[PDB]
Design a protein around this nucleic acid. Structure first.
Ligand SMILES: NC(=O)c1ccc[n+]([C@@H]2O[C@H](COP(=O)([O-])OP(=O)(O)OC[C@H]3O[C@@H](n4cnc5c(N)ncnc54)[C@H](O)[C@@H]3O)[C@@H](O)[C@H]2O)c1
Ligand SMILES: NC(=O)c1ccc[n+]([C@@H]2O[C@H](COP(=O)([O-])OP(=O)(O)OC[C@H]3O[C@@H](n4cnc5c(N)ncnc54)[C@H](O)[C@@H]3O)[C@@H](O)[C@H]2O)c1
Ligand SMILES: [Mg+2]
Ligand SMILES: [Mg+2]
Lengths: 205, 205
DNA sequence: AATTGTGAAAT
DNA sequence: ATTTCACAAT
DNA sequence: AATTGTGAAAT
DNA sequence: ATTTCACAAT
């Protein structure tokens, strides 16, 4: 919430309260939440307590009340449109994933080089693909200010600048390259090679 | 190294020293490394100092000496064979990524349901795909004890147990589901929806 | 009413 | 900065 | 030889 | 537990 460590769990808590809600479970204790998340229960309680007093003593937490509270925190009572740039290996994995079946996000358009064979067409799921040179045109009346960036590493900086210039305010980047961009622009990195190589480091200790 | 925070950066440092080495840069200061990584230089120095005294005062760090030192720490003077289970959206993104062009890892085989149409064939890059029921057979003389797990969430636990039973010691899992497995088995999670939704949380604060 | 919310300690 | 302990409050 | 390695403080 | 300060050592 305030604390970065807690803010990184919010999405994990929301999923769990949703899963309980689907499974017909109406109450959950912080021990049950801790165990489904693989963390300690004291962190769940300290996490929730930044948002006020959400449980009751001796009972636990009302699953629906918490599912809905977290949806509000996560802005999941409104729809967020995202774009994806770079329709290549990971690009396409994401494009075909129905984010919107579980949360109120969706990739509503994608971009690639103007010469890509997918430009001018749609995804099997109806997501239109356009040339990167037209980004300014399509960004009008999309409500998009968030980009998924899945272009080659050597092009990440150059394409990040195009996105920012064109109005993008937040980037999830799969390139392992620190983007130099103004500090108001939020950048979250996913680094798959580093994740795999770090797994191997832990296995060898 | 000892400290978890530092161990999670090792892979990031290795890449940077490799990149410098490719770019013909022979020396690097902790400020230059900090700036390419987007962190503070005091953490770079404190990070490196867990491994001893790797630089020299007034100079910085010898890029080749550090590239090679990190390759040793990361076990990158030997080849690690990985398997991938679940040849679906993210599965395939990974299968087509040449991990071995940059590090000494490779996905040397994959698995899917026995009825999948890819079973019995190879990847465009020569990676053979087999039925999950044959996992014990193929795990013989592969040197594989690491799995990438990219099956649906509802099947993650059931397939994680098959992998462990069959000899797998480390799992990188893309399912957002805490796997319950013995504590000697190292599990690293990647959670793409939570990463995207957390980006959006940061953008709205 | 069996489990929360939170100071204080530990890391 | 973050986790975990530990217990009076309900 | 301009920058490291590290106690001490801050978080 | 982790980061960042800040400075004597080279
Ligand atoms: N695929 C993986 O599993 C994997 C693994 C580790 C890291 N990564 C990283 O993720 C990034 C992308 O990976 P990938 O394998 O999907 O790469 P890819 O080459 O398969 O996809 C890149 C896409 O971006 C497009 N592109 C290039 N320049 C562009 C531009 N100026 N504007 C718009 N689009 C442009 C390309 O045409 C291509 O479709 C890389 O930084 C890579 O290092 C991917
Ligand atoms: N694709 C994405 O961008 C994305 C985004 C967010 C989360 N995820 C998560 O990653 C996981 C996989 O995603 P996906 O979209 O690639 O799913 P997918 O359904 O596209 O792929 C799953 C694959 O696993 C195979 N499979 C099923 N049971 C199996 C078994 N018992 N043994 C071996 N293989 C089996 C399926 O045949 C299929 O090929 C899910 O947990 C999903 O929530 C993916
Ligand atoms: Mg990489
Ligand atoms: Mg998910």
């Amino acid at each position: 919430s305030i604390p970065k460590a807690t803010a990184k769990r919010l999405s994990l808590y929301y999923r769990i309260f949703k899963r309980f809600n689907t499974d017909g479970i109406e109450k959950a204790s912080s021990k049950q939440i801790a165990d489904a998340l693989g963390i300690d229960s004291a962190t769940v309680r300290r996490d929730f307590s930044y948002f006020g007093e959400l449980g009751r003593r001796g009972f636990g937490y009302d699953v629906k009340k918490l599912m809905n509270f977290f949806a509000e925190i996560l802005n999941d009572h409104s729809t967020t449109n995202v774009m994806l740039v770079g329709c290549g290996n990971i690009g396409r994995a994401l494009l075909h994933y129905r984010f919107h079946d579980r949360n109120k996000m969706q990739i509503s358009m994608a971009f690639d080089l103007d010469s890509n064979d997918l430009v001018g067409k749609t995804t099997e799921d109806g997501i239109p693909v356009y040339g990167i040179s037209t980004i300014n045109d399509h960004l009008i009346d999309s409500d998009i200010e968030t980009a998924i960036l899945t272009v080659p590493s050597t092009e990440a900086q150059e394409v990040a600048d195009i996105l920012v210039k064109a109005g993008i305010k937040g980037i999830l980047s799969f390139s392992p390259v620190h983007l130099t961009l103004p500090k108001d622009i939020i950048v979250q990195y996913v680094d798959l090679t580093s994740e795999l190589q770090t797994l191997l480091y832990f296995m060898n200790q």
